[PDB]
Curated annotation (Swiss-Prot), chain A:
Anthranilate 2 binds at residue 161. Mg(2+) 2 binds at residues 219-220. Belongs to the anthranilate phosphoribosyltransferase family. GO terms for cellular component: cytosol. Pathway: Amino-acid biosynthesis; L-tryptophan biosynthesis; L-tryptophan from chorismate: step 2/5. Binds 2 magnesium ions per monomer. This is Anthranilate phosphoribosyltransferase.
Length: 339, 341
């Protein structure tokens, strides 16, 4: 195995042999890959079109280098709510709403607005060690794994990612390398082909996940139009077309849903959790419900439609009853009380 | 203009906007491109499939950073004989034969398996010479060699990345398109049919008289193992042709018979061929030398394809069998040894 061999195979538009993606990622994680080699691999893998097996090797090697949460501190029904990339506004709000509905949530991200930035603008302490993320989950029902603290060996790839800027297969790794390893979640992707790849990876993990792609390009469930959902459970995938109009959701415009910077997002979080109505609320409710449906897929034998009706009810209620606003405040309170 | 913009465009399999490739290359040449950005660009451009316009921008910017040869020192009808990589043994021998046939030759390359420059050094040729001495070599010997690191010092950042990733990229095309002497004709081989057509487009834009050649066995030269595709470039237009050496009496050969080796072995092969040794290596050398001579003729006329080749094959054969090729290499070595005094 070597870079000329692996890079050559990719530029020739061939899928890699089993273990080659893993070899490449291990070189990258151990500081043995030159920045040029990392970049070449990232780009070549992207333009070749990665397979689920390849991405599975990349994520798997990365996790083998990550710091875990302490034993028996992550509830086995914890969920993730995130997109691959911007809808940080939607995913941040959805995550808070899901937690306020009684579902444990553990997120994973970094400062870019990134997921971490919006949370910091709300007064949340994002940079916590494993022991305290665990406490946060137990005491608040939500936690955040700061990527630099849990994936320190990813620093070389991270530097290259910043330098080239363009999205690559590495953008898919965030959701697939949550160090808390939640077994469920709502995972958005901006590209349909890659969404399907991600669903394949989650399937092999026996997770209960909704991998979602707005047919308008959104890396969340959209209200602008239909969405494609890759419904993942019991080692298999159920691909379907999803229309929120069937749940009474008005059609919105794309410019209404797009996130902004950390402060603009924070302002939007405060307004929505305060009860402000509009397209942004609807999108948050929609994706929160999606996460709740995924959560139900773990234990409940509840069917698709009734699961959604209950998920939408619980999401809306988490906002309307002030539970979400109250949970965020409790989350901020927790970080301040650590000192 | 930015890397995310340019790299984003390529990963979406779109051709670049005008000037974007030029911007990228200028960043690379001035040392302002990070290795990761250079690598990303090279790979992305390769997998998208580069256009003639894009490569023309790369080559043009690279040339603007290069040291030129002195004014009025390069003969108007100088030719190049080179491959973009798989046959260094063949292009080197063909170059000497072409020079011996009276066609000025100016090559361009680097030390590498013996590279083009390495083989010549093994024969006693001084390869690392400034522009004034390359000019003198062309005048006094009829052949010259531009040492790439000497003429393209600002390319060091790109070359370091090329070695690191190892895989062939669009940058492998730049050698023949950035010859500092800027010969207007030549025999240019490429191991990839699609990239060969791109190069032909660039030479056409320059209104060069060139044969871009591709062995249908993956050879970056005219092969004797099988047929070859040839893009006849002349008068700003391109004619794509199939080429069978058998139509000129050449017997089919095996690929392993044209096998290069270390610099000492290639040198031995050069001495053998120039000494008149018959065989498939000679045949391949004569065939590629003739190709360059046909391209040279295209500068001053549009002679018929078949008789051009027959005269070219004849001239190349004569250059060897008169001893002219062997004598020219000796004059080349002699010239190099004279520089010290
Ligand atoms: C300096 O060390 C680091 C710098 C940046 C990062 C990330 O940025 C990773 C990230 O988002 C992930 F995809 F979630 F993993 C990790 C380590
Ligand atoms: C140390 O600085 C350098 C190192 C290597 C080279 C090349 O090797 C370029 C080359 O082949 C060309 F495309 F023909 F120009 C140039 C400068």
């Amino acid at each position: 195995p070597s870079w000329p061999q692996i890079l050559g195979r990719l530029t020739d538009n061939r899928d890699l042999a089993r273990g080659q993606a893993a070899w490449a990622m291990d070189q990258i994680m151990t500081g043995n890959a030159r920045p040029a080699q990392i970049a070449a691999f990232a780009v070549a893998m992207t333009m070749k079109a990665p397979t689920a097996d390849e991405v599975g090797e990349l994520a798997g090697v990365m996790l083998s280098h990550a710091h875990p949460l302490p034993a028996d501190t992550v509830p086995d029904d914890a969920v993730d709510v995130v997109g691959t990339g911007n809808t940080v506004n939607l995913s941040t709000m959805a995550a808070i709403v899901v937690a306020a509905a009684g579902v444990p949530v553990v997120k994973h991200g970094n400062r870019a607005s990134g997921g971490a930035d919006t949370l910091e603008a709300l007064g949340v302490r994002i940079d916590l060690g494993p022991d305290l993320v665990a406490r946060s989950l137990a005491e608040v029902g939500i936690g955040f794994c700061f990527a630099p603290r849990f994936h320190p060996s990813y620093r070389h790839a991270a530097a290259v990612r910043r330098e080239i800027g363009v999205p690559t297969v590495f953008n898919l790794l965030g959701p697939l390398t949550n160090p808390a390893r939640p077994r469920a979640g709502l995972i958005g992707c901006a590209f349909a082909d890659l969404a399907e790849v991600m669903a394949g990876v989650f399937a092999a993990r026996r997770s209960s996940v909704l991998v979602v792609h707005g047919d308008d390009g959104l890396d969340e469930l959209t209200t602008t139009t239909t969405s494609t959902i890759w419904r993942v459970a019991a080692g298999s995938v159920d691909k379907l077309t999803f229309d929120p109009a069937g749940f009474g959701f008005a059609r919105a415009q794309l410019d209404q849903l797009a996130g902004g910077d950390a402060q603009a997002n924070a302002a939007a979080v405060r307004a929505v959790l305060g009860g402000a109505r509009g397209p942004v609320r609807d999108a948050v409710v929609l994706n929160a419900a999606g996460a709740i449906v995924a959560h139900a897929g773990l234990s409940s034998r509840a069917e698709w439609l009734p699961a959604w009706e209950e998920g939408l009810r619980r999401a809306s209620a988490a906002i309307d009853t002030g539970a979400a606003e109250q949970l965020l405040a409790r989350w901020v309170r927790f970080g301040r009380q650590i000192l």
